[PDB]
Design a protein around this nucleic acid. Structure first.
Length: 209
DNA sequence: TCCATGCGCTGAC
DNA sequence: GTCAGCGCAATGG
């Protein structure tokens, strides 16, 4: 089994692999947290992230995308998400992701000195991101490969509050699952949406009324 | 092609 | 132990 702090591709899981639920992606080890968008350790880096339309400031352009840090939210009331209500900080997950950038951590943002040498980030695209992105899968989750943090900086988001932003760029030899060659490669490998054991059945039952 | 609301759960300290 | 949290197969206005 792969350790929680494993950087890079997970052996046995090619780009294009799909899962219906987040907990499945966790089980696979591609993205351990079942809720958080960022999986990271503040003294090491970010191992993976998921684009799921959870933050209004994300900008998805396929091989390039601007990701938003987490936080700057008031979850009092046993919540897991909310709108921005305060400034984000370069701490926890946000700091973990900045460490991937090939450059020393910088409180005012930083750029990489050869982004390709930065630490790898496993990127997963979720269908909820499709409300504002043409690269999101139609259903569930899809592993799109390895990306690297080219740079990160702070600025006011749409809500007026400060948010941390990261520019990620793809660095994977496998083709993008959303392109023609990616679509083909997925078929050849015979990859298909994976569901938890007994789900499809339980679903067919439910669909009787 | 909605939006708000809590809850169980797991990884990081 | 505490807290964060880009969920959700769910539930209600």
């Amino acid at each position: 089994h792969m350790p929680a702090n494993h950087f890079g591709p997970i052996p046995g899981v090619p780009v294009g692999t799909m899962w219906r639920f987040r907990v499945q992606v966790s089980e696979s080890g591609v993205h351990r947290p079942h809720v958080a968008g960022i999986h990271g350790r503040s003294n090491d880096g970010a191992y993976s992230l998921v684009l799921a339309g959870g933050y209004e400031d994300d900008v998805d352009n396929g091989n390039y995308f601007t990701y938003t840090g987490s936080g700057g939210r008031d979850l009092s009331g046993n919540k897991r998400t909310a709108g921005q209500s305060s400034d984000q900080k370069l701490t926890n997950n946000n700091r973990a992701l900045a460490l991937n950038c090939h450059s020393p951590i910088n409180e005012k943002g930083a750029e990489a000195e050869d982004w390709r040498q930065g630490k790898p980030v496993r990127v997963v695209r979720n269908m909820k991101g499709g409300k504002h992105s043409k690269y999101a899968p139609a259903e569930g989750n899809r592993y799109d490969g390895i990306y690297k943090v080219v740079k990160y900086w702070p600025e006011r988001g749409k809500s007026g509050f400060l948010v941390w932003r990261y520019l990620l760029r793809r660095d994977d030899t496998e083709p993008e699952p959303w392109t023609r060659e990616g679509k083909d490669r997925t078929r050849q490998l015979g990859l298909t949406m994976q569901y938890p054991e007994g789900y499809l059945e339980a679903l067919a039952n439910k669909e009787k009324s």
